[PDB]
């Protein structure tokens, strides 16, 4: 979509990592470009979790690391995260610009689940 200063599958890895960290923590402080890009990745998994079937669990399992909370991340999604967002039709996140970072000047935002 937009290249993130990374190589292709390195970028794939970074996005998978951020989506897992998001649905585990429910809010993460990241860079605005990374947040813009994860916004369109963590929000296509909540759709699969609102579907719920076996095929949806596996399509979600192929874009989601393994970290136990005890639960998994995937049980977290097809379990208790997908139920809270049952009524709204898309728009399951938001970005909040904290501001510039020291050492970078990177635009730091806070992304989260609505």
């Amino acid at each position: 979509y937009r290249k993130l200063g990374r190589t292709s599958d390195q970028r794939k890895a970074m996005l998978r990592d951020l989506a897992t960290s998001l649905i585990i923590s429910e809010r993460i402080e990241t860079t605005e470009a990374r947040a813009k890009e994860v916004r369109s990745v963590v929000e296509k998994l909540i759709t699969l979790g609102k579907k719920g079937d076996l095929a949806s669990r596996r399509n979600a399992a192929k874009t989601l690391r393994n970290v136990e909370i005890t639960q998994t991340a995937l049980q977290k999604l097809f379990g208790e995260i997908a139920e809270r967002y049952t009524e709204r039709q898309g728009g399951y996140t938001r970005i909040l610009k904290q501001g510039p970072r020291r050492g970078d000047g990177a635009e730091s935002v806070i992304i989260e689940l609505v």
């Binding site: 909040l96 610009k97 904290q98 501001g99 806070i110």
Partner: protein
């Protein structure tokens, strides 16, 4: 290449005419009471309320 002639301290300052940095483009927070930067979270106290 190398400079053929050392630069006067007039041409220098003319070239640094545009070496400014603008102000950030800030506002005052209606909640915190102080200056925040527009479209950003308030530094001092908490909320954004947009």
């Amino acid at each position: 290449a190398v400079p053929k002639r050392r630069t006067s301290k007039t041409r220098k300052n003319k070239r640094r005419t545009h070496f400014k940095i603008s102000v950030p483009g800030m506002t005052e927070c209606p909640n915190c009471g102080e200056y925040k930067l527009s479209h950003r979270v308030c530094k001092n106290c908490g909320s954004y309320n947009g």
